[PDB]
Design a protein around this ligand. Structure first.
Ligand SMILES: Nc1nc2c(ncn2[C@@H]2O[C@H](COP(=O)(O)OP(=O)(O)OP(=O)(O)O)[C@@H](O)[C@H]2O)c(=O)[nH]1
Lengths: 70, 843, 73, 79
RNA sequence: GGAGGUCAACAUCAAGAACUGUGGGCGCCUAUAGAACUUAUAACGAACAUGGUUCUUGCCUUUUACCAGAACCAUCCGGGUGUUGUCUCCAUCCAUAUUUUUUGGAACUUUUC
């Protein structure tokens, strides 16, 4: 159990997350969890109106995680 | 094509997984891998591969009833009669195999069996040139020695990941019969010893960089491999992983809870011994010592294993091997450990970059192939290449280049050969291939003619892509040949056959140099006795069918001196004065060591293409080198170093610049040869003191004048600087029992050099490590003198590292000393005697 | 337990999922989560069909199991 | 368990899958997990609408996966 | 049926891939014969003796004697296997209600074709 996922290669890089309720977020990947709870900094919503926030996303919610730039 | 395949398929001995999945897997760059196997003499290498082979193949065709059971180790990859009869691996034979791992994701693995005899290090270098990582196999009894240090040094130097295997553990327990408490200690010592030479990384039976095995018997361990297989079932999975961290070094568990405290309370042991070594011992004791009925209960109780009576009806050794292979299943601990130990991103740019300039441009969509070794298979000569990029297929027209040419770096440049076929090595058979993809190593038919030894294979469709492309650097073999044989055929009329054969030998043996004398005699250089012996055997048997005369083993000498010039052109307009100087041993050593100047390491002069300020910085930093002289370093020779040093360098530097290459070309030309014996010069620095130039240079300063003039001046300078001869020396690694020491001492005295650099008790065994040095000219037969005088006990290896030529005793130029023919030269002069015998051969 | 589940091995099965879709094919591998592996699979969304091949379903997704035919030789 | 090892063995090949989302993803698989996480490249998504897109890198949660679709040679693999 | 038979008879006898011929069974498989290549002549026997011929060493130029090398053939003492008839003895896979599966984000409504 508790296989600590392979998110070492995403640390301190920009992301394009998707979550439950078709809502999505951009941010710098700070830290991750056993259950895939995430720490994002410089968090910006994608409503198309983009609101700056500054965030801990829950693990359950997460659908996926992308990279903007190669 | 299909017909060929159908016939071919019958030949090969089929396998359990099948080719199709193994062929199927290839496309991913990440999937699959390249691994080489090295280690000192009889470390087990070949038999380790044999283990994998026997796991994979159901038949096997070759096995005798006898061998399959026990006593004679089956040898695969020893497909050469010479090797079989000699009994030691000589020429490397690949095995390619679809292997599973603990995760259950199979990958294709290219394995390379390299020879561990010190004379065939060249073979190891060739393997390394292709392999991603290396498995270094150490005998638990032998421990580590000089060749191990050399091997790890080079391996890491070339960014080859290193995973250790400590083999013959059974011997430690059965041969030496060591107690478990002491056994652990001995292993730990070995582990420590490897680590100190290694820099920046630290292993441990807990990082899974070290594997424990007995090839002979039939088993391989990692501390991970064991825990999952037997312990894991016993306890909750979450906890177990930690168990391994609490398994190695300083950890004891009293009764469910384990405390780092020494062993308070009564009976005590650290865990490794508790859960591993003790039961292993019990297995040994229990199988041989125990009634065969008793054993069954334990197999069902402890292991859930059930043997038939036919498994009991063997004998101690074959029974034991059966049981160990029974309990410890296919060697996937090994495979798994390999799998999760290499990261492509970290090494790969570094390993590619070193062979080639850093670049990099036009990546992808382009064919690229490094050709290393060539292979004398049943049919013809095959070419072995590493799929650097793209894809190969049958009949593909491929451009081919040879490295020395590359050294050099449009129409005329490109020769090409179509690729007739590609096969995948499997020791004794070759599996037919339609196409080859980047990552893998393959056998090519028909690319051979373009290249002798190494070559770089590329296909470029692009003019910019072509410009970017960097040719692979010449492989740097670990040792220099030194040993010298003169050949002539028995009957002179058969010369053409000899000539052909010699060329073939150059293709097959990367360490051989064939030179042709005025006389038509053939000078052969090889690394050492055994090496050359094998060449001669193949030459007389396999290639030429001609009986030939062979001379008395000699050695290549080197010229030198220890501390002014006047000179005149054939058309007296030029006049040259050049100083000749002894060089600092530090400097010499720095030059001998091929390096990039990385870490704190003194920069290798071949880094001269970098800013002279930097080059001069190194000289000033490491030597307190004169600032003008350091700035005036022109170039190195084919060896030592050239400096500009006079007022006319300021008077007419532009004029002088026009003549640099003519000088530059000449000097390699002049130093490559020599005034005493036409032999190359060492430890000598030259400084231009004066250069007169013809009034109005009416195309007067021609290469036809100055090149030979310069050459002459060098020769004169060397002579007036008091020349000496240098002789190459081996490092003598001798392993013996203590009371045989005095014998060894006497042998050294008798040979000539009689020098022993160090004596080290081999902790854990009844053996000494003896390091000495010996003059190659006095080396003929040395090894047999040892073997015979010690009554078969102990052994010797001669290895050329450091490549240091010591001053030959006597003055280079005195007539008086020598005494008549057939008498070994008196000690006062070995320099004068050496010149005359060589002098006569020159003319 | 899982004694019954091994008995189903290598039979053509009709598996209804939470989505309503129904997969069909032989059963090669089975789990404690009820992860099923199925060979030569065909969905029937409903007058419809699709060819997939090897399909690995989760436990969350599966509703019911039912044998279509006996084990093949 | 075998239903997880089969997955790990299709790493490298191209895979199709379905999520609770409703969309299907297709691409080369780089890494998997016992959880059923995934890491893929050059993905070609196709939702309920039919809308195609490109995603360079992706991570997933297994909980969100419905089912996978795996290459054909992965039926001769050992169980 | 079984073990053992110091009982015999009759066959063969290193192993392996590949060519040709014959026979049987439904292009494939099995058996037998011949030729070529490999292993190391790993050994049919962890033993090893005599003789014939042809050459090359010593000889009285003679032997029913030899010296000590070579090649080619033979004999002799043994061994294995199958088969057939006999003989004696004996029987006829772990247990988790709190984030990646099994203690639910479900429930419900409406419009379009
Ligand atoms: N006692 C013992 N010896 C072993 C074991 N494994 C290998 N050896 C030794 O390895 C030798 C045979 O192994 P080979 O693989 O043929 O030799 P090698 O390691 O290939 O040697 P090279 O060909 O020179 O590399 C035997 O003489 C053994 O002494 C082991 O587990 N126990």
């Amino acid at each position: 159990m508790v296989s600590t996922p392979e998110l070492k290669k995403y640390m301190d890089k920009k992301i394009l997350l998707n979550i439950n309720g078709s809502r999505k977020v951009a941010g710098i990947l700070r830290g991750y969890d056993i259950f895939l709870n995430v720490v994002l900094d410089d968090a910006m919503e994608i409503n198309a109106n983009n609101h700056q926030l500054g965030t801990v996303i829950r693990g359950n919610s997460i659908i996926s995680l992308e990279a903007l730039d190669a | 094509e299909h017909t060929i395949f159908t016939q071919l398929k019958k030949n090969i001995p089929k396998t359990r997984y099948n080719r199709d999945y193994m062929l199927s897997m290839a496309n991913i760059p990440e999937r699959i891998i390249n691994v080489g196997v090295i280690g000192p003499l009889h470390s087990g290498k070949t038999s380790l591969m044999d283990l994998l082979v026997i796991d994979s193949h159901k038949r096997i065709p070759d096995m005798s009833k006898n061998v399959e059971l026990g006593w004679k180790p089956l040898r695969y990859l020893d497909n050469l009669k010479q090797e079989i009869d000699r009994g030691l691996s000589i020429k490397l034979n690949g095995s390619t195999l679809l292997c599973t791992d603990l995760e259950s994701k199979s990958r294709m693995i290219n394995f390379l069996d390299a020879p561990g005899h010190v004379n065939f290090m060249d073979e190891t270098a060739v393997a390394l040139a292709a392999s991603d990582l290396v498995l270094i196999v150490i005998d638990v009894v032998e421990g580590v020695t000089f060749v191990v240090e050399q091997l790890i040094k080079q391996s890491i130097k070339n960014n080859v990941a290193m995973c250790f295997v400590i083999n013959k553990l059974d011997r430690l327990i059965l041969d030496l019969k060591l107690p478990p408490m002491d056994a652990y200690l001995k292993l730990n010592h070995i582990i420590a010893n490897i680590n100190s030479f290694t820099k920046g990384n630290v292993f441990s039976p807990i990082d899974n960089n070290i594997i424990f095995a007995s090839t002979k018997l039939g088993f391989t361990f990692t501390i991970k491999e064991f825990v999952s297989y037997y312990y894991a079932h016993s306890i909750p999975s979450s906890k177990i992983d930690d168990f391994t961290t609490r398994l190695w070094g300083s950890v004891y568990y009293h009764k469910g809870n384990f405390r780092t405290k020494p062993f308070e309370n009564v009976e005590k042991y650290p865990t490794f011994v508790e859960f591993i070594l003790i039961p292993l011992y019990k297995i040994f004791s229990y199988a041989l010592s125990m009634e065969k009925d008793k054993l069954k209960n334990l197999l069902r109780s402890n292991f859930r294993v059930n043997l038939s009576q036919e498994a009991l009806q063997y004998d101690p050794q074959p029974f034991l091997k059966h049981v160990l292979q029974l309990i410890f299943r296919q060697q996937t601990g090994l495979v798994d450990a390999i799998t999760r130990c290499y990261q492509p991103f970290e090494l790969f740019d570094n390993k590619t970059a070193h062979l080639s300039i850093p670049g990099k441009s036009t990546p992808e969509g382009t064919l690229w192939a490094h050709v290393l070794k060539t292979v004398d298979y049943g049919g013809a000569e095959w070419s072995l290449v590493r799929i650097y990029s793209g894809l190969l297929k049958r009949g593909d027209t491929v451009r081919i280049l040879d490295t020395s040419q590359s050294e050099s770096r449009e129409d005329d440049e490109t020769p090409s050969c179509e690729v007739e076929e590609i096969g995948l090595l499997g020791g004794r058979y070759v599996y037919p291939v339609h196409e080859a993809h980047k990552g893998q190593i393959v056998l090519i038919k028909g690319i051979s003619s373009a290249y002798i030894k190494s070559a770089t294979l590329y296909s470029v469709k692009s003019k910019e892509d072509m410009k970017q492309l960097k040719f692979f650097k010449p492989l740097d073999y670990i040792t220099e040949a030194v040993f010298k044989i003169v050949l002539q055929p028995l009957l002179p009329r058969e010369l053409p056959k000899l000539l052909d054969a010699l060329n073939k030998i150059s293709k097959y043996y990367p360490g051989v140099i064939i030179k042709v004398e005025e006389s038509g005699e053939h000078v052969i250089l090889g690394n050492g006795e055994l090496y050359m012996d094998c060449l001669l055997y193949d030459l007389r048997a396999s290639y030429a069918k001609i009986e030939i005369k062979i001379s008395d083993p000699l050695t290549v000498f080197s010229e030198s001196c220890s501390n002014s010039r006047l000179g005149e052109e054939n058309l007296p307009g030029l006049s040259i004065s050049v100083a000749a100087e002894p060089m600092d041993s530090k400097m010499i050593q720095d030059l001998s060591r091929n390096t990039l100047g990385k870490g704190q390491n003194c920069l290798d002069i071949d880094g001269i293409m970098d800013n002279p300020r930097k080059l001069s910085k190194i000289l000033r930093t490491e030597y307190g080198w004169d600032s003008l002289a350091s700035r005036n370093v022109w170039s190195f020779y084919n060896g030592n170093v050239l400096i500009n040093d006079t007022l006319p360098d300021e008077i007419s530097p532009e004029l002088l610049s026009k003549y640099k290459e003519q000088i530059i070309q000449g000097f390699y030309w002049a130093v490559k040869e020599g005034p005493l014996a036409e032999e190359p010069i060492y430890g000598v620095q030259y400084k231009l003191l004066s250069i007169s130039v013809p009034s109005d240079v009416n195309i007067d300063v021609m290469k036809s004048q100055i090149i030979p003039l310069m050459k002459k001046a060098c020769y004169v300078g060397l002579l007036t600087a008091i020349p000496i001869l240098l002789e190459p020396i081996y490092e003598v690694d001798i392993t013996v029992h203590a009371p045989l020491l005095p014998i060894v001492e006497e042998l050294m005295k008798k040979r000539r050099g009689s020098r022993i650099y160090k004596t080290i008790k081999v902790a854990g065994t009844p053996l000494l490590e003896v390091r000495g040095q010996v003059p190659v000219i006095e080396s003929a037969g040395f090894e047999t003198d040892l073997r015979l005088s010690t009554n078969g006990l102990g052994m010797c290896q001669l290895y050329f590292w450091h490549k240091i030529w010591r001053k030959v005793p006597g003055d280079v130029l005195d007539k008086d000393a020598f005494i008549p023919k057939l008498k070994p030269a008196p000690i006062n002069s070995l320099s004068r005697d050496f010149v005359m015998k060589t002098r006569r051969r020159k003319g | 337990h899982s004694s019954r589940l091994a008995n189903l091995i290598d039979y053509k099965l009709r598996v209804l999922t939470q989505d309503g879709r129904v997969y069909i094919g032989q059963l090669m591998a089975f789990d404690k989560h009820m992860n099923l592996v199925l060979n030569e699979c065909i969905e029937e969304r409903v007058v419809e069909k699709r060819v997939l091949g090897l399909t690995i379903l989760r436990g969350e997704q599966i509703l019911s199991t039912v044998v279509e035919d006996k084990p093949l030789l | 368990g075998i239903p997880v090892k089969l997955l790990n063995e299709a790493q490298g090949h191209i895979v199709s899958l379905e999520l609770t989302t409703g969309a299907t993803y297709r691409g080369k698989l780089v890494e998997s997990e016992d959880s059923m996480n995934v890491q893929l490249r050059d993905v070609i998504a196709t939702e309920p609408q039919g809308a195609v897109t490109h995603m360079d890198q992706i991570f997933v949660r297994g909980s969100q996966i419905k089912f996978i679709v795996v290459p054909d040679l992965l039926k001769n693999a050992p169980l």
